[PDB]
Amino acid sequence: SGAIYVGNYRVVNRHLATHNDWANLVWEDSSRDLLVSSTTAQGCDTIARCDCQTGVYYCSSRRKHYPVSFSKPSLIFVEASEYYPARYQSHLMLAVGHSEPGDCGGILRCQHGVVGIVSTGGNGLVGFADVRDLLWLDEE
Ligand SMILES: CCN(CC)C(=O)c1ccc(N)cc1
Ligand SMILES: [Zn+2]
């Protein structure tokens, strides 16, 4: 689990969104595994605006931060999940590293701020849902 808090926005994995997330929906994309809900409290997190391909992610299944190299956001096919059908995910970045079902929402960050959240795992790979193209997160 995990979320991004920027301004009056909460970013979570779409498959982990709560009833309150959906009751306060700003935006969701099934193809990206993202949902954004509105918050009353102001968020502190800064979204990276950059093309970094290196950063650090939090891995809850190891209680560790790992530095990773990752691919640019792409349409990637993702193998079977106990949350989704095996299918295409857009705006996904892959790295070599550890990711298990509870690692979703772990934040990937570079020097510019938050890059994305853990969305996929298995086969020694970790997939991150990119948020850097969501420029609208930085106003209203
Ligand atoms: C997580 C999906 N879900 C119900 C399981 C909802 O978002 C939900 C929220 C408000 C509501 N009146 C009805 C449904
Ligand atoms: Zn960066």
From Swiss-Prot:
Protein's name according to its UniProt entry: Protease 2A
Known function: Cysteine protease that cleaves viral polyprotein and specific host proteins. It is responsible for the autocatalytic cleavage between the P1 and P2 regions, which is the first cleavage occurring in the polyprotein. Also cleaves the host translation initiation factor EIF4G1, in order to shut down the capped cellular mRNA translation. Inhibits the host nucleus-cytoplasm protein and RNA trafficking by cleaving host members of the nuclear pores. Counteracts stress granule formation probably by antagonizing its assembly or promoting its dissassembly.
Record lineage: Viruses, Riboviria, Orthornavirae, Pisuviricota, Pisoniviricetes
Enzyme active site: H15 (for protease 2a activity), D33 (for protease 2a activity), C104 (for protease 2a activity)
Span within the parent record: 869 to 1008 of 2193
Subunit structure: Homodimer.
Superkingdom field: Viruses
Naturally occurring in which organism (per UniProt): Coxsackievirus A16 (strain G-10)
Reaction catalysed by this enzyme: Selective cleavage of Tyr-|-Gly bond in the picornavirus polyprotein
Annotated residues for binding of Zn(2+) 1: C50, C52, C110, H112
